[PDB]
Design an enzyme around this catalytic site. Structure first.
Site: not given
Ligand SMILES: N[C@H](CC(=O)O)C(=O)O
Ligand SMILES: N[C@H](CC(=O)O)C(=O)O
Lengths: 233, 232
Positions: B83-85, B197-199, B10, B52
């Site tokens: 994933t943060n979200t 966001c982890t990316e 994710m 989402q």
């Molecule tokens: N990488 C995820 C992005 C997601 O879950 O949509 C984050 O950190 O939020």
């Protein structure tokens, strides 16, 4: 898609390309934000590699079969073992786990077959190069013969794998040494070269090889994608 | 060591740094050829991300809770959600899976606390920036307040995440835009910036940010290593 079960961390450096390429393959075929359904069990490689050096192959079979059974309990529908050497104990996994087992040497044998080749060079760990488990399968299923390096070259190739590549060190002197062994085996009529340890691809770009390269980790990855989508499978 | 269970994919682009950093952490602490005991369930991100956008959050909680139980059945001893979200549905995972759950915002809150800061910038998906699930926890648990970009900037930051970063494209145009948003939030008294966001750290090097960077994926991976070794 089918969920693929990966047996990895042997070493973790080569498990990353499997994960990358299986995700890239699913993205290529399904498009958009689609990514691969993956279950991965990554081992502590120390236990595996120490057992190699002590000849405790049955113990590693126990470790890997239990891991595959665990992934089956989590929903895996096929097994990819992310290491050429540990296919020495593939029959432990295949016996004990009912999931399809995508043998790395079958995928490589199909690739070499498609290139029209029957005489190739094999680089890998000392176990893969010297023993019968890997080469015997290429001979018996595909009539493919492997040339291997000389004793002194095998020692150094193996040393570089375990003392450098599995620790993330990719040096030019080791890259040149590998390239030199490939060119020498080319002088022996080798038609291509198997990167038959999954870390070798991280060290040697295809540009540095005077022979066409069969990268077992990449080939295996593509085989997994085909299985997940029921193509070619 | 304890076996860590990772809920990833994710996107898969940011699951790789978790895997890399957790293995490097184990290598550094145990030495030799030691590597991390890891179970990873990587999802098809399309199902999660489509949900989402539809607000189908309960369905994602079901997916991720079932994944965490599957990893528990394989031998995982703790859960890391990459994933943060998706920590918006952490409570679905925790109510269903009894394993310790290493909350990404707790790891980040401890890091920010350690640097003595209480007013930071937050970049992330639009859901992470605008809703209360993430910032509310930092406020309640740590008395940390987050500044977020203006509406137009949040739109673009979010567009870059899903249309570029999650597809593996890391452009200078987008890198520069993120750096400009960071500088603008610095003018507002931000003491550091959360890459929430982890990316984002795949796009923006630290030397790009005019503020000290809290990279949530790295901080979370370090938290995982400490849990696996019973450390910190
Ligand atoms: N990488 C995820 C992005 C997601 O879950 O949509 C984050 O950190 O939020
Ligand atoms: N990466 C493994 C190394 C090992 O299992 O020893 C291989 O391909 O052989």
């Amino acid at each position: 898609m089918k969920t693929i079960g990966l047996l990895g961390g042997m070493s973790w450096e080569s498990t990353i390309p499997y994960y990358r390429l299986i995700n890239e393959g699913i993205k290529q075929r399904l498009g958009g934000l689609h990514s691969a359904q993956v279950l991965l069990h990554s081992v502590d490689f120390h236990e595996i590699e120490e057992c190699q050096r002590r000849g405790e192959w049955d113990k590693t079979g126990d470790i890997l079969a239990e891991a595959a059974l665990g992934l089956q309990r989590a929903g895996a529908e096929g097994i990819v073992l992310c290491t050429n050497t540990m296919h020495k104990v593939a029959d432990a996994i295949e016996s004990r786990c009912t999931l399809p087992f995508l043998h790395i040497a079958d995928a490589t044998g199909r690739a070499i077959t498609g290139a029209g080749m029957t005489r190739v060079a094999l680089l890998g760990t000392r176990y893969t190069m010297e023993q019968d488990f890997y080469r015997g399968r290429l001979t018996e299923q595909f009539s493919i013969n492997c040339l291997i390096p000389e004793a002194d070259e095998r020692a150094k190739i193996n040393q570089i794998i375990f003392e450098e590549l599995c620790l993330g060190q990719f040096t030019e002197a080791s890259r040149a040494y590998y390239a030199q062994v490939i060119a020498r085996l080319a002088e022996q009529g080798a038609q291509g070269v198997i990167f038959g340890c999954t870390e070798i691809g991280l060290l040697v770009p295809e540009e540095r090889s005077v022979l066409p390269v069969f990268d077992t980790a990449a080939i295996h990855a593509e085989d997994a994608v085909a299985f997940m989508l029921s193509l070619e499978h």
